[PDB]
Paper text:
Bromodomains (BRDs) are protein interaction modules that specifically recognize ε-N-lysine acetylation motifs, a key event in the reading process of epigenetic marks. The 61 BRDs in the human genome cluster into eight families based on structure/sequence similarity. Despite large sequence variations, all BRD modules share a conserved fold that comprises a left-handed bundle of four α helices (αZ, αA, αB, αC), linked by loop regions of variable length (ZA and BC loops), which line the Kac binding site and determine binding specificity. The four helices form a deep cavity that is extended by the two loop regions (ZA and BC loops), creating a largely hydrophobic Kac binding pocket.
Interestingly, most of the 43 BRDs tested were highly sensitive to modifications flanking the Kac mark. Similarly, the BRD of [name] showed no interaction with non- or singly acetylated K4 but interacted strongly with H3 pT3K4acK9ac. For instance, recently, the dual-reader module PHD-BRD in [name] has been shown to specifically recognize a combination of H4K16ac and H3K4me3 at the mononucleosome level (Ruthenburg et al., 2011).
Author numbering: 2793 to 2911
The structure:
């Protein structure tokens, strides 16, 4: 990551942009597996094998409460969503495919956000 992403404290203005990014992901058709925490009754051994679960509702709470100090930390939580999903699910699963699609969408939005921050 670039130095602004790593070092620049997130401001209130930055948080408006973070909320916009999160809302765009929540609204995406392929976000359905990531909207809320993984249900243990749907996913055998999940919480036994996934050390740091994450989901979009948890990130929404963190954005509201100003949890993140640096953009890198917001990106790290988001990246957990996708990495956890690819870790636990087979590559031919619809879940895995959702992670591939939504991650690409997130990267597009994130670049947009970083650009906007820079001007």
């Amino acid at each position: 990551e670039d130095a602004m992403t790593v070092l620049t404290p997130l401001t209130e203005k930055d948080y408006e942009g973070l909320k916009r990014v999160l809302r765009s992901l929540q609204a995406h058709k392929m976000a359905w597996p990531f909207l809320e925490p993984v249900d243990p009754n749907d996913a055998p051994d999940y919480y036994g094998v996934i050390k740091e679960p994450m989901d979009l509702a948890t990130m929404e709470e963190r954005v509201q409460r100003r949890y993140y100090e640096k953009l890198t930390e917001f990106v790290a939580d988001m990246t957990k969503i996708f990495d956890n999903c690819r870790y636990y699910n087979p590559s031919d699963s619809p879940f895995y495919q959702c992670a591939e699609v939504l991650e690409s969408f997130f990267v597009q939005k994130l670049k947009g956000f970083k650009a906007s921050r820079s001007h």
